[PDB]
């Protein structure tokens, strides 16, 4: 009969049942959204947003709620850190319950369409057979897509009749949902300009709307109709899978590299902020202009916010996790409690050494303390015998500036080594490893997991697009080849391949 | 000339590069 991998092909030529299965899939996806939101809310810890934000807790789907308006909870807390006094219905809980209710309603609609499948809407008046006028259905759907895109751009994102979207500063320290005016011009095409989102969703939507008016009105040319097999729904499936993996690759790129639509405080920093020293340079210039203002190292480093110092830490890097190191980022190094300050390394004389930072590539990196110019001065040797650059020989002391360990000058070699090991990983922090029983191996942020999943899905959907394009373009030879193939495939039988009017 | 174009697009760079390589054997540092 119908093998296990063809079982969903019975609904290929039954439009009502096709709507039913689409409804069931939509119901399942909405139910997943609601259930994931509920589970995340059950396991979320909203107490500390600066050292235990959403992305440190493995919050995958909540940032997408917080990205475009839903920053509050019925429990009287906000992802931004403020305490909500009178939360509205559209909180995290309300969104979750709405998605569950929509899942139930879509399930009921799927049941109705599965039972009542033989509607005159799906039957061709000319022939009476079940059929779908796909070019016009596409125009209707493109009208709907354009209207929704324009509405989102003009009302939701601009906040004319909506919350706006998440906007943040350069360093993720002061971010909130707010309206964004549309950025018409070249600046709208900056991926890190949130305003360019609005300018897009308006303008693109308008064009989409206009495109809908074309596709409802204008019938396809016969040439493209026969070439693309527009009367075959599997053409639509192939092209849709094509566009879908295209979008998946684009979203994967904007996730990994970052953009205005992937704020760091919602998904964690990127690997490239760590690679280029994006936050280290900002902290350095902050303390430098503080020093130029007459402040000292203690005061200058005390003015650095804990959030900014937390970003300057390799454990927050998405390129440090593992494929099977599962769970929240707090399950690895731990839950960050406090910042111990900048460990200046004053050598025996007083020169400032600096521990070379771990690159993301290396699981384990040697602890070497390079000089200002960078000749190696001291390090933690592997072979102690005949050691030249041991911290014992050179002599080093760790003076802490800022943080809870401020103003403390350790000058023993052991305690210097212990904080050299910490300074190898960027800024040094205190961690709670007991609440979640953390095992001391780094995990990936939601940024990395999104990138992984959608990269793999994009490749697999490229395979699917190949398969279904092949099927729709080779429908006539699905069951096998006939005897006609033997005459045309002969070399030189016809001047033009395939065509038999030639010779 | 398409046969000529294909075969000679393959051939002319090939002999040119082989002559260059046989010369390059003698560079002798």
């Amino acid at each position: 009969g119908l093998p296990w991998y063809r079982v969903h092909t019975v609904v290929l030529n039954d439009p009502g049942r096709l709507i039913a299965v689409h409804l069931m899939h939509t119901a399942l996806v909405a139910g997943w959204a609601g259930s994931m939101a509920l589970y995340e809310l059950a396991v979320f810890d909203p107490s500390d947003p600066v050292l235990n934000p959403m992305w440190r807790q493995g919050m995958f789907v909540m940032p997408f709620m917080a990205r475009i308006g839903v920053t509050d909870s019925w429990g009287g807390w906000s992802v931004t850190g403020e305490s909500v006094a009178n939360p509205g219905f559209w909180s995290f809980e309300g969104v979750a319950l709405a998605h569950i209710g929509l899942s139930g309603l879509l399930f009921l609609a799927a049941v109705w369409h599965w039972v009542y499948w033989d509607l005159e809407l799906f039957r061709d008046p000319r022939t009476g057979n079940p059929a779908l006028d796909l070019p016009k259905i596409f125009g209707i759907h493109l009208l709907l897509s354009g209207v929704l895109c324009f509405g989102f751009g003009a009302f939701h994102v601009t906040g004319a009749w909506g919350p706006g979207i998440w906007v943040s500063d350069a360093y993720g320290i002061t971010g909130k949902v707010q309206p964004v005016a549309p950025a018409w011009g070249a600046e709208g095409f900056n991926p890190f300009n949130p305003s360019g989102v609005a300018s897009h969703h308006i303008a693109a939507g308008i064009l989409g709307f206009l495109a809908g008016i074309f596709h409802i009105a204008v019938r396809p040319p016969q040439r493209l109709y026969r070439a693309l097999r527009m009367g075959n729904i599997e053409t639509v499936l192939s092209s849709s899978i094509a566009a879908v993996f295209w979008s998946a690759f684009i979203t994967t790129g904007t996730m990994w590299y970052g953009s205005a639509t992937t704020p760091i405080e919602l998904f964690g920093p990127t690997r490239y902020q760590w690679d280029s020293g994006y936050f280290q340079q900002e902290i350095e210039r902050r303390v430098e202009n503080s020093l130029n203002e007459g402040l000292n190292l203690s005061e200058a480093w005390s003015r650095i916010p804990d959030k900014l110092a937390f970003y300057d830490y390799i454990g927050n890097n998405p390129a440090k996790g593992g494929l099977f190191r599962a769970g929240p980022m707090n399950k690895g190094d731990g839950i960050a409690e406090a910042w111990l300050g900048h460990p200046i390394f004053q050598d025996k004389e007083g020169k400032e050494l600096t521990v070379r930072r771990m690159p993301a590539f290396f699981e384990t990196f040697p602890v070497i303390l390079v000089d200002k110019d960078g000749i190696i001065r001291a390090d933690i040797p592997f072979r102690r015998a005949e050691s030249k650059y041991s911290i014992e020989q050179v002599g080093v002391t760790v003076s802490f500036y800022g943080g809870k360990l401020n103003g403390q000058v350790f000058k023993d070699a052991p305690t210097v080594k212990k904080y050299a090991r910490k300074a190898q990983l960027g800024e040094v922090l205190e961690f709670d490893r007991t609440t979640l029983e953390s095992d001391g191996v780094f995990r990936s942020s939601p940024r990395g997991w999104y990138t992984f999943g959608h990269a793999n899905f994009a490749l697999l959907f490229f395979l699917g697009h190949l398969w279904h394009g092949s099927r729709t373009l080779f429908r006539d030879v699905f069951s096998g080849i006939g005897a006609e193939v033997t005459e045309q495939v002969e070399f030189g039988a016809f001047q033009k391949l395939g065509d038999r009017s030639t010779k | 000339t398409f046969r000529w174009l294909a075969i000679h697009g393959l051939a002319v760079p090939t002999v040119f590069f082989l002559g260059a390589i046989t010369s390059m054997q003698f560079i002798q540092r």
Binding site: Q495, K496, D499, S501, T502, K503 | -
Partner: protein, 39 residues
Amino acid sequence: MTPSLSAFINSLLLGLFVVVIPIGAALFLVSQSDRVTRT
């Protein structure tokens, strides 16, 4: 207009006049000259 934008526009123009237009013209002439019989 930045140097990069000028380079991009020039790249489009040279792509037209060095790759697309020559290949298209050659295809058109050869297809119009060497024609199949009994089509």
